[PDB]
Amino acid sequence: TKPFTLPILTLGELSNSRFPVSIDQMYTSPNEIISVQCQNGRCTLDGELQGTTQLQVSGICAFKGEVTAHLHDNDHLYNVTITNLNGSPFDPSEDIPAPLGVPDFQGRVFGIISQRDKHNSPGHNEPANRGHDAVVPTYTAQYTPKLGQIQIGTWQTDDLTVNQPVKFTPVGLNDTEHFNQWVVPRYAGALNLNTNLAPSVAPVFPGERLLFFRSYIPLKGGYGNPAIDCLLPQEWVQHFYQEAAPSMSEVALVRYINPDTGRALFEAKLHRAGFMTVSSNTSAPVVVPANGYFRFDSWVNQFYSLAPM
Amino acid sequence: TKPFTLPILTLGELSNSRFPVSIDQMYTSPNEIISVQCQNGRCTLDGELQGTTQLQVSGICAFKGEVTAHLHDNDHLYNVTITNLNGSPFDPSEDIPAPLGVPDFQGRVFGIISQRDKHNSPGHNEPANRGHDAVVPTYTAQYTPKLGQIQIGTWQTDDLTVNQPVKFTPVGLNDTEHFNQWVVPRYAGALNLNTNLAPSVAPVFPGERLLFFRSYIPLKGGYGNPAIDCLLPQEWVQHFYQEAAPSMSEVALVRYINPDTGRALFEAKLHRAGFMTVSSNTSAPVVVPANGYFRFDSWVNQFYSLAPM
Structure with missing residues (x-):
């Protein structure tokens, strides 16, 4: 069975999959954001693109x-x-x-x-x-x-x-008027339900929250610092599509590695649907060294209790 | 901005764009003919040839x-x-x-x-x-x-x-069997929709009807006097293609000039898509002096109420 892998990329080498800009930080979801259903940057760990996701940043x-x-x-x-x-x-x-x-x-x-x-x-x-x-x-x-x-x-x-x-x-x-990054448009108007959507994603374990790759995008005028949070960097979408590695369980355990020591700074659940959760009580930026990177360690199950971060 | 113009041509100098013969008369559309979608003699006022239109009478x-x-x-x-x-x-x-x-x-x-x-x-x-x-x-x-x-x-x-x-x-x-000048052929047969067609054209204002340049074409046998009505003379297609003058509104107001007085005999809307309408309650030939000719007067809008003719 073809082993599952992530590309080897630092935060400064990651592209947002929901807006065509570079990632600024990793960020844990606010308490009010329990479930999301974005349609760009959607790809299963086995390489199935979903929603409106395509491969190019320029798209x-x-x-x-x-x-x-x-x-x-x-x-x-x-x-x-x-x-x-x-x-x-x-x-x-x-x-x-x-x-x-x-x-x-x-x-x-x-x-x-x-x-x-x-x-x-x-x-x-x-x-x-x-x-x-x-x-x-x-x-x-x-x-x-x-x-x-x-x-x-x-x-x-x-x-x-x-x-x-x-x-x-x-x-x-x-402007920020009517900006809600987590409300999917009615792509066919109000008479028609959206079809073929990538599914909603959510933590299923107490104490866990979503881990986003966040960019602060430009604003033509007015006050604001608007964030677009994606579930997967575009490079991970591209890699999983290329690899099509079979998923061996519902959750891939991934660790953020500090290459100067080889040790993990934190761990996260990378779910089969293509999103991550962490055990964290706060919603804030996740500060990591510029040289750190995520690495796949092992297939686990949904009961795995992540180390707090 | 390059001004839009018509060539200066009398009725006796105009060529049909849908059959390779001379124009016989101008003719207002019958009540039953509200919309048409011919594919030869199609050119926007800004010089975009459409449908199957090409430049030569011999084609x-x-x-x-x-x-x-x-x-x-x-x-x-x-x-x-x-x-x-x-x-x-x-x-x-x-x-x-x-x-x-x-x-x-x-x-x-x-x-x-x-x-x-x-x-x-x-x-x-x-x-x-x-x-x-x-x-x-x-x-x-x-x-x-x-x-x-x-x-x-x-x-x-x-x-x-x-x-x-x-x-x-x-x-x-x-013969006149199966002759319908306003039914576009199925160019690729019944399994395939026609593609890249020039759009349908119609009056959008009550009391208006289409103004055609009409030829009565030969018939090898039988009874009949078959008409081919075109939206634009071939010379207008050729002129607009050469000039490529930008269209400043959706409707060019044109007047049929009597050069002996300089006065307008009637006026028409020359729409951006490349067709004309007139305010007329009758469908019949439009009788004009041999020396008269159309002239562009001004860009107007779709609400313009034409003088009756």
Whole structure:
């Protein structure tokens, strides 16, 4: 049986799987956050990608599509018929919640909408281009990527062309209004239940809480320090997908190694579904040396009582 | 911003974009024709060719290919593997509904199939040739140009050579059986939805109807006076493609000018998608002086109430 492994990466070498930025810290879940159900950064230990998870950092919270309408009520709004990230048509009958990569939380995502026209004009051997600041609200009835359509807003009011293809590059949040990182959008609107979701995850043992890989992401304006917590770094998603090592129990015991001594600084349960819990009474950053890294030690079971940290 | 313009052409100088004949009249749409979706003569005001539209009159309802079979069930039938109009292989993965130029309506198209053999015979410094009357039905399961094949019929029964290249020059309809100018063929047959179609067009304002450029095309036999209505003259397609002027709103207000006075005889909405509507309660020819011509006056919006005509 192919042994299960983690890649060998320090905190400074880990990428967030829910927003395309570097990890800032490990962080234990607050008391009020007992269960979560994010859809990016979801992969079982045996290498099954789930939810809206795909392999590339450049796909996380990104999308592609075609501008299909410029709204006159508010000349700052445009409807986009989305595609898959590779540009191919999105088939809503596919067994996924929404096109892979789309945002998996409620918020006002800020980035750039870039448009390169599909054909050249006589006299020009390259296509025309225009790009602009844009906001993508994910908490409204207009965010229906599973129905093939998302609505965006710009600050400019007549420089996206209808029927030309777009790419959205996420940067951060526009503001913290309506930001709830743990509320999954209604990908097909209110008449339809989300389908094919990655399952909820939670500690099942008293005294345990979730261990997150956290990034503090940009904010275009206002006060705030918004956090995006992921269950697995993108590199672990990528590694498990490559390896497809069979899971021998429901819980992999992992230890954070200090390579100067070879000793464990703390231990965690890495559950088969692809998330970790720790025995901790506090919600706070987990301070570790820059050179430390997680290592798989052994398959255990769900009754294992972790050493407090 | 490059200003949008029309060419300066009278009715007698306009070419149909859906059949390779001269325009006979302008004609307002019947009450039963509220929406259409033709695929030739499709071009946005900013110069994006759409559907099966190409630039040359000689391509409209024409095709090229190779005879690949002579049928014995009915010795009057031949299968043709079609190419692009320039003779290059047709790639069915290309983002178009069918090779550019093919007929975009249901009917029995009459023309000449001409065959010039690919190599010379010893003793002859030029290739052998044969041409014959032919009919191309576009409404049957045998019309599958997007799958690379069209079936034709002749009156002669052994004078097209298998494996030699053909050119179809359209002339008119054979008869009016199965003629419906507004039903788009199933370019890839019944198992496949048409792809990459130019969109449907319709008035969106009460009292308005479509304004067509109409030709009465030849009929090989029987009773009839068949009309082909196009949304844009071929010269407007060609001009918009050359100019690629950005569209400043969804509707260009155009006026039909009487040059003897400089005054407008009527006005129309020229929509961004490339079609016109007028405020009219009747469906009939629009009688104008031979010297009149359309002129772009201003960008307006979709709420503009046209003067009745």
